[PDB]
Write a protein that binds this ligand. Structure first.
Ligand SMILES: Cc1cc2nc3c(=O)[nH]c(=O)nc-3n(C[C@H](O)[C@H](O)[C@H](O)COP(=O)(O)O)c2cc1C
Ligand code: SF4
Ligand code: SF4
Ligand code: SF4
Ligand code: FES
Ligand code: FES
Ligand SMILES: [Zn+2]
Lengths: 126, 92, 259, 99, 442, 231, 113, 56, 216
């Protein structure tokens, strides 16, 4: 809880621990880690997936669009960010350094001197 | 035609010796891009302010720059500060 | 009268009664963004980046133009001060041409420096920008009037420091011309100070134009021998080649100006 | 920082001779605390940590030195506090951090 | 009480209908140069006290205490520095014509008022900065000034009271910025009329470095008439803190545009209906009313129905009395067009000494141009309101704050109409992909 | 328009500009208004005289002469000229027609009047006609917002009450040179149409407006009140 | 059009420093180290009381209080060698904190598992 | 080389100057697409995706 | 986070994301997205009441709809009061949040009489539908029809707006609106003709002048 970094704090994954600490135990740990990583990757992909669509009230046939990426692909990689951070999403999708002078200054500073970092010592583990 | 390093030439080409044959730049800059861009003609623009990006869309060329086509002298063209294209006034 | 007491961000400080708010901030190590006020030039309210929120005050006050009042509390770190500074920066950035890649000020531009530090972060004025053609003043002053913010720095420096009278504000509204009325050159033995006086890439060293950026120059402080005064200067170089030279602050020799 | 956190004052309690100075910041995690220690009672501190209940279950994670000789605060110089690791490093010549 | 009905008995501007000669003849017929020596013999302190007891509020932009402003002038300059009294007869604010009428109809009353002000402030010199647009008015004023100087009321001996008064008339230019105090002083010095640092006090350092006190033409005009009548006479014509009368100039979409003098705190609807035949098409057809200059925001129909022509009443309604210019717009006017026209006028009036003010004016003009066609959004209205708020209180002079108030009032008042116009434009123009380039040039 | 001197030979330094003796004589009174220590305060009267005597077009040579007279920088003179919109640095037409484009004028129908005027001249609003007789411009509020619509010619003798037929007749008169200055309607100057509800009683206007006051008694009362407040 | 809040106003940059004098440092020893009590002027009741009063008034903390700074936890109970009951309380608090921390784990600690 | 904001004749002249005959430089189409914000040209893959054999 | 901090909104009406630490908002969003039980979601929302956001509530509703999570007595008891409070706290800048909440409640056939009354009052009496996009308005109407919880006045206003925005109808939104209308049998011959051809001229469409005579 005090060390979870990005996305494991809310997703369910299975971790296997050996009862011998041998080479076979390490190999089994690696294999089980690969399998559980496949499962966790599937779960994470589903978390950003639109599993449901608007179904017609008349009968029960799903109202599938004809000119939509949602109709083409069920996965919407921008749905969560667009719904939760619409201001930042629009700001990023609209303004660019070729169009905004402030964005041009940001591109120049990031490519010449870099963003300034406050003084301090930190230690981050992944 | 006028000899380089003259006072008139310095006043004209912003205190620089312009190269007509463009081979001097093609050797100094290792590219004939100077003459290649010089092959372009002069464009007449109706508006006194133009928006030049060197291309067709934002980030598809250079950053947009506003050039003032209305100066003290009529018919004086201005080359883009971002691209090699030059634009001039439609009439004066 | 002799030692007034103010509170800078809640920190009590004994300062002089005649010093400005910006003077008190600079003395107390508080960096206040500024674009028009120069300590050796005339005090003017041309810029509004010094507009600072003071406790129990209705509107922001230009710290460079405003003196210190006894008992005043300046909350420079306050959200009101941050919002005012962001608004001022956004207003300033409205008509600045997108010429940073094509301007010699890149890497040492107070404009971009304030924008990254005291700026809003993004731009929102989605309209065509005004444009004004540059002037021709000789091979010493490189003119870019599009980025000229009409800071009156050139006019103030010429009138007060160099003493020559050739710079002034022509026009009004959003089309004021930061340059001379007639076409002429600026030859007053202090042309190298005009580039060092422009807060934006309006005036630059034409011999050093497009030479390099500050990120690739190595500066060493030395003294000149060309003039009998030997004013202190800083020579910036890149590898075996010397790039350029700039004046050094030496009040005992030549203040901060060179020939 | 919504987890239970407390300063390991037992170190200074057992030492009973060293003025404890602890620091906790949100830059690190919620379970990271940094304390300055004198080099005189350094092996003693290490042994006490290595062989004490509620602390014997510990493992050395990392160790690194900082050349505090030339480490100088580049910006926001006036923002330095009176209990800052930056000021402490500026005071000394080197700082060995064992995590 | 029920104010808004002042008879001709106490009217100061009796020749407002050009009913007499504006020269010395009609002036003496209108009460000019009467008991001037006696009034001056009361002393600067007594004259200032009478002006303050009259409850005089600044007739120009602010409505500040004229008596306090005059008393703020130094009694004596220790270094012998002179004094200057400025009368700002350069009114370039749209909607107002009271000063223009006063200059061409009552020339010597302003001269007597300026002389009284100079005597109160010990000023040896006065400058009437007359608008460059008022050319014939300037000629008439110069003729009247020459007549008064020949009359002995001004010059080496001003009415024979041992106080030399010199008067000059400054024919300015189209500079609403010079319409200000500090800008007027700068233009008087011979430079561009950019306002000076604030507060640099003009009373502490004004024109030519000498202390200078600037006052509106209408405020200085009532100086001798009020002193002759008595402080109660001019102080019983309005509500508390708003004492005196006002020459309200009504125009726009009114039935009978004109400019008339009435008691302060006049009811808005009563003054509109009685003095001009009401709004053309009745009170139902009126859509908006600006009670002051272009700076003052437009007011709504309900507010116009229930409001009084007073400074405090206008402030409570959100508007401002200002120059008391009553601009009436009926139901057939697109408020966006009026906003764009006022934006063009104001951006052509800001001196640009403040980058905030200049850039804000330009961006507001652009937004107004884009809003009329409908190539904008509801969020554009919010952005415009935010920009107007940012411009306020962050400029050199009050000009930078002046332009934002009308935009703020229009936004607060006409949200639905702008939304409907935008909806019409958008339903008339669908486009899924928005171009990343800036707005197309107009 | 152009804040910088356009590259026009008509305003070049070679243009002969010398002030008239009457203008030179008139300078005696203008300089006396400001102190001798500040003679640059007469720059406005000097520019006004130049614009009057130089066909409403201020030459650069005239500006240089003014700077020589004023002992002030030529850059300062040019800045003062450009800072104001009442000065024309280039040769304008015979009639600098100015129409108020502000909101108070536009409400009364200034756009229709401007359209009619432009149709009469067949010239753009922002340009000058080829004939060289007139030059149109959409001026700001000329101080006649109450009497809108209002036009002006050569910065003097501003006309008001600008309707379509009224403006056509006024333009024809201007061609003939005999036009009714001010409003071309029945409004009594500032007394607008539809009657007159201000100062309808004229006997009091002719009542000599004599208001008397014994200032010595009032000053004594003020001094006595001050003494009583002190006590 | 919302450019006011592009830059974050709140960042996880809160830092707290807790300072405690030596646990075994006596109150008289603490006053001597701080200079309130002279090294030789010890074992005198009046001098000890004066030094303690000076330490309390000037340092805003009791001379018997070993907590100089407690920004980490803002605790008020100093732990002193003479304070055996306070030491017992600290031990109990440490045991309870250990139990609570081990009881707050989602997958790290599981007695049932 | 030029965007839609340019004039039609100027665009055609610029296209001819670079010796461009592959990109569409029609003046009528340039005037018709003045200030356009279309997404892009798109193709349509038609099912089934099968190899196009040359069999005879 | 909360130490030495006040969770009070600056606007005094709704708390924007700019007032809270980004880490807290991200954690709340992740927890909402990972709530696989009605009781768990209710507990998470109640515990995070001090820093709850309208965007977070909209995301929770979207997740409940997408995952088809059953609404139980916990949803009817705990979620309903917080939802009602948030709806009462809504404003004109809450167009997206209100529209998403209404659409999700309708699509999930959520049966909350008080919440539906509050939503109807906000949509009709406050007339914030003008800030709802045409496609978004059609989707909201379809949702309201899915649970058959909608006002006929709002339906008529939506039909009129759809007639107004004839040039902006995409085929997918047109089909969705046609299903929403024919399912509830709510519509007009003009609306049906617009469904047949939205980008059609004014000749084929009958009554277009009369429909446009009334604005909005
Ligand atoms: C842009 C601008 C224009 C102004 N125009 C006028 C004007 O036309 N008349 C006026 O009396 N004051 C005008 N003022 C206000 C003056 O600066 C000054 O405060 C005022 O004339 C004082 O007169 P009062 O106290 O009688 O109101 C203007 C101010 C600004 C900033
Ligand atoms: S002066 Fe030049 S480098 Fe600085 S912001 Fe302007 S364009 Fe960029
Ligand atoms: S050109 Fe440069 S120095 Fe001169 S006024 Fe403009 S910004 Fe200032
Ligand atoms: S507010 Fe405008 S007009 Fe006034 S000094 Fe500032 S920039 Fe100039
Ligand atoms: S830089 Fe300080 S007021 Fe201009
Ligand atoms: S708006 Fe017409 S002259 Fe003032
Ligand atoms: Zn280019």
């Amino acid at each position: 809880k005090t060390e979870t970094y990005a996305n494991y704090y809310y997703l369910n994954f299975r971790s296997y621990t050996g009862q011998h600490g041998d080479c076979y135990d390490r190999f089994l740990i690696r294999m089980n880690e690969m399998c559980e990583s496949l499962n966790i990757v599937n779960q994470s992909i589903n978390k950003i997936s639109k599993f449901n669509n608007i179904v017609s009230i008349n009968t029960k046939k799903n109202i599938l669009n004809k000119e939509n990426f949602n109709r083409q692909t069920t996965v919407l990689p921008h749905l969560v960010l667009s719904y939760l951070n619409k201001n930042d999403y629009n700001l990023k999708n609209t303004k660019n350094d070729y169009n905004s002078m402030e964005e041009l200054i940001t591109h120049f500073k990031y490519w010449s001197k870099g963003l300034k970092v406050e003084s301090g010592y930190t230690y981050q583990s992944v | 035609n006028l000899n380089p390093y003259s006072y008139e030439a310095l006043k004209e080409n912003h205190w620089l010796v312009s190269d007509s044959s463009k081979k001097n730049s093609e050797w100094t800059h290792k590219s004939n891009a100077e003459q290649l861009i010089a092959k372009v003609p002069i464009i007449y623009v109706d508006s006194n302010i133009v928006r030049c990006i060197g291309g067709t869309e934002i980030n598809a060329g250079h950053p947009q720059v506003y050039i003032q086509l209305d100066t003290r002298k009529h018919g004086t063209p201005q080359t883009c500060k971002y691209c090699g294209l030059r634009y001039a006034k439609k009439m004066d | 009268n002799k030692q007034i007491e103010i509170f800078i961000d809640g920190k009590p400080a004994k300062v002089d009664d005649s010093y400005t708010i910006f003077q008190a901030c600079y003395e107390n190590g508080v960096i206040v963004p500024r674009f028009c006020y120069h300590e050796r030039l005339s005090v003017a309210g041309n810029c509004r980046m010094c507009l600072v929120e003071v406790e129990n005050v209705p509107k922001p006050v230009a710290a460079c133009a405003s003196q210190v009042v006894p008992g005043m509390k300046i909350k420079t770190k306050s959200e009101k001060t941050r919002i005012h500074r962001g608004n001022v920066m956004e207003f300033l950035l409205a008509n600045h041409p997108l010429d940073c890649p094509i301007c010699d000020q890149g890497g040492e531009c107070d404009l971009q420096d304030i924008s990254s530090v005291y700026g809003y972060g993004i731009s929102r004025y989605n309209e065509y920008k005004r444009a004004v053609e540059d002037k021709n003043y000789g091979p010493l002053v490189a003119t870019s009037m599009n980025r000229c913010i009409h800071c009156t720095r050139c006019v103030r420096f010429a009138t007060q420091i160099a003493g020559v009278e050739d710079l002034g504000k022509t026009g009004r509204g959003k089309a004021a011309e930061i340059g001379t009325y007639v076409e002429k050159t600026f030859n007053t033995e202090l042309s190298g100070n005009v580039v060092d006086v422009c807060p934006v890439g309006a005036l630059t060293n034409a011999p050093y134009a497009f030479t390099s950026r500050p990120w690739e120059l190595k500066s060493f402080y030395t003294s000149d021998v060309f003039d009998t005064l030997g004013s202190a200067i800083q020579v910036d170089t890149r590898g075996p080649e010397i790039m350029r030279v700039l004046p050094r602050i030496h009040e005992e020799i030549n203040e901060e100006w060179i020939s | 920082m919504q987890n239970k956190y407390m300063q390991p004052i037992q170190l200074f309690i057992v030492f009973e001779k060293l003025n404890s100075k602890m620091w906790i910041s949100k830059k690190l995690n919620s379970n990271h605390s940094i304390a300055l220690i004198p080099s005189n009672w350094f092996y003693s501190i290490n042994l006490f940590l290595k062989r004490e209940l509620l602390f014997s279950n510990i493992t050395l994670i990392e160790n690194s030195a900082i050349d505090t000789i030339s480490y100088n605060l580049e910006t926001n110089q006036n923002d330095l506090d009176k209990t800052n690791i930056e000021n402490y490093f500026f005071k000394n010549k080197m700082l060995v951090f064992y995590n | 009480r029920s104010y808004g009905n002042l008879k001709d008995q106490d009217r100061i501007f009796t020749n407002l209908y050009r009913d007499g000669d504006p020269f010395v003849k009609g002036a003496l017929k209108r009460g000019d140069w009467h008991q001037t020596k006696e009034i001056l013999s009361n002393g600067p302190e007594w004259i200032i006290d009478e002006i303050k007891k009259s409850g005089l509020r600044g007739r120009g932009g602010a409505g500040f205490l004229s008596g306090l402003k005059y008393s703020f002038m130094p009694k004596v300059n220790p270094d012998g520095r002179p004094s200057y009294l400025v009368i700002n007869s350069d009114e370039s604010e749209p909607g107002t014509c009271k000063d223009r009428e006063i200059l061409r109809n009552d020339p010597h009353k302003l001269v007597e008022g300026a002389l009284v002000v100079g005597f109160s402030m010990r000023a040896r010199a006065a400058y009437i900065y007359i608008r460059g647009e008022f050319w014939v008015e300037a000629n008439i004023l110069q003729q009247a000034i020459d007549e008064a100087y020949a009359k002995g009321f001004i010059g080496k001996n001003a009415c024979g009271s041992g106080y030399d008064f010199d008067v000059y008339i400054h024919r300015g230019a189209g500079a609403y910025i010079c319409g200000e105090e500090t800008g007027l002083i700068e233009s008087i010095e011979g430079k561009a009329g950019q306002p000076r640092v604030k507060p640099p006090f003009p009373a502490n350092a004004g024109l030519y470095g000498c202390p200078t006190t600037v006052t509106n033409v209408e405020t200085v005009a009532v100086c001798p008439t009020i002193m002759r009548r008595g402080a109660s006479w001019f102080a019983s014509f309005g509500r508390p803190n708003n004492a005196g009368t006002k020459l309200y100039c009504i125009s726009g979409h009114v039935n009978n545009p004109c400019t008339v003098e009435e008691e302060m705190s006049i009811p808005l609807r009563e003054l509109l209906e009685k003095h001009c035949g009401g709004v053309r098409g009745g009170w139902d057809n009126l859509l908006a009313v600006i009670p002051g200059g272009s700076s003052v925001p437009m007011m709504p129909k309900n507010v116009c129905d229930d409001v009084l022509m007073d400074f405090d009443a206008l402030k409570a309604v959100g508007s401002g009395l200002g120059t008391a210019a009553v601009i009436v717009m009926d139901k057939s006017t697109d408020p966006i067009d009026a906003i764009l026209r006022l934006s063009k006028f104001y951006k052509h009036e800001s001196c640009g000494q403040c980058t905030p003010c200049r850039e804000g004016t330009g961006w507001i003009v652009d937004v107004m141009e884009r809003l009329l066609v409908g190539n904008a959004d509801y969020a554009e209205i919010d952005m415009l309101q935010q920009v107007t708020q940012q411009i306020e209180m962050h400029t050199i002079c009050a000009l930078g704050d002046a332009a934002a108030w009308p935009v703020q009032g229009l936004i607060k008042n006409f949200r639905e109409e702008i939304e409907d116009r935008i909806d019409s434009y958008h339903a008339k123009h669908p486009q899924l992909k928005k171009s990343r380039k800036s707005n197309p040039q107009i | 328009r152009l804040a910088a001197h356009r590259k026009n030979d008509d305003n070049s330094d070679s243009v002969p500009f010398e002030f008239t003796p009457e203008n030179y004589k008139e300078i005696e009174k203008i300089l006396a208004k400001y102190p001798l220590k500040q003679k640059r305060s007469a720059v406005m009267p000097l520019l006004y005289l130049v614009q009057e005597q130089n066909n409403n077009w201020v030459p650069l040579s005239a500006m240089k002469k003014i700077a020589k007279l004023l002992e002030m920088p030529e850059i300062d003179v040019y800045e003062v000229a450009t800072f104001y919109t009442m000065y024309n640095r280039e040769p304008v037409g015979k009639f600098h027609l100015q129409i108020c484009g502000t909101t108070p004028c536009q409400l009364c129908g200034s756009r229709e009047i401007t359209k009619a005027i432009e149709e009469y001249t067949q010239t753009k609003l922002g340009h000058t006609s080829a004939d060289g007789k007139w030059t149109l411009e959409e001026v700001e509020c000329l101080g006649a917002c109450s009497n809108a619509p209002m036009i002006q010619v050569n910065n003097k003798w501003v006309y008001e009450d600008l309707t379509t037929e009224n403006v056509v007749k006024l333009l024809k008169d201007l061609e003939s040179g005999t036009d009714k200055k001010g409003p071309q309607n029945h409004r009594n100057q500032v007394e607008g149409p539809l009657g007159r509800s201000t100062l309808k009683e004229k006997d009091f206007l002719s009542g000599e407006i004599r208001f008397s006051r014994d200032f010595a008694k009032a000053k004594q009362d003020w001094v006595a009140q001050k003494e009583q407040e002190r006590i | 059009h919302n450019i006011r809040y592009h830059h974050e106003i709140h960042t996880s940059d809160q830092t707290y420093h807790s300072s405690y004098d030596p646990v075994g440092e006596t109150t008289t020893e603490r006053l001597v180290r701080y200079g309130y009590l002279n090294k030789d002027q010890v074992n005198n009741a009046e001098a000890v009381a004066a030094a303690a009063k000076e330490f309390q008034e000037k340092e805003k903390r009791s001379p018997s209080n070993n907590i100089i700074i407690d920004e980490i936890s803002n605790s008020d109970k100093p732990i002193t060698k003479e304070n055996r009951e306070s030491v017992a309380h600290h031990v109990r608090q440490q045991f309870e904190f250990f139990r609570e921390v081990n009881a707050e784990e989602v997958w790290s600690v599981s007695i049932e598992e | 080389a030029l965007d839609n904001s340019f004039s039609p004749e100027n665009i055609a002249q610029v296209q001819s100057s670079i010796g461009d005959k592959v990109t569409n430089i029609d003046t009528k189409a340039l005037a018709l697409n003045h200030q356009t914000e279309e997404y892009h040209k798109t193709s349509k893959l038609v099912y089934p995706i099968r190899t196009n054999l040359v069999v005879e | 986070s909360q130490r030495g901090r006040d969770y009070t909104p600056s606007n005094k009406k709704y708390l924007q994301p700019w007032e809270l630490e980004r880490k807290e908002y991200v954690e709340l969003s992740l927890a909402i997205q990972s709530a696989y039980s009605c009781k768990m979601l209710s507990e998470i929302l109640k515990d995070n009441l001090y820093m709850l956001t309208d965007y977070q509530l909209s995301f929770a509703m979207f997740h409940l709809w997408n995952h088809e999570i059953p609404i139980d007595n916990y949803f009817y008891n705990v979620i309903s009061p917080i939802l009602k409070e948030y709806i009462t706290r809504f404003d004109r800048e809450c167009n997206k949040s209100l529209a998403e909440i209404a659409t999700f409640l309708g699509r999930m056939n959520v049966q909350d009489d008080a919440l539906w009354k509050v939503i109807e009052t906000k949509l009709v009496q406050e007339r914030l539908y003008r800030y709802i996009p045409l496609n978004d308005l059609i989707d909201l109407a379809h949702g309201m029809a899915t649970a058959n919880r909608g006002s006929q006045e709002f339906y008529n206003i939506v039909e009129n707006v759809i007639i107004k925005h004839r040039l902006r109808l995409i085929p997918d939104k047109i089909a969705v609106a046609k299903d929403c209308f024919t399912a509830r049998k709510i519509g007009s011959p003009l609306l049906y003709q617009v469904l047949e051809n939205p980008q059609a001229e004014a000749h084929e469409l009958a009554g277009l002048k009369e429909h446009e005579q009334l604005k909005i």
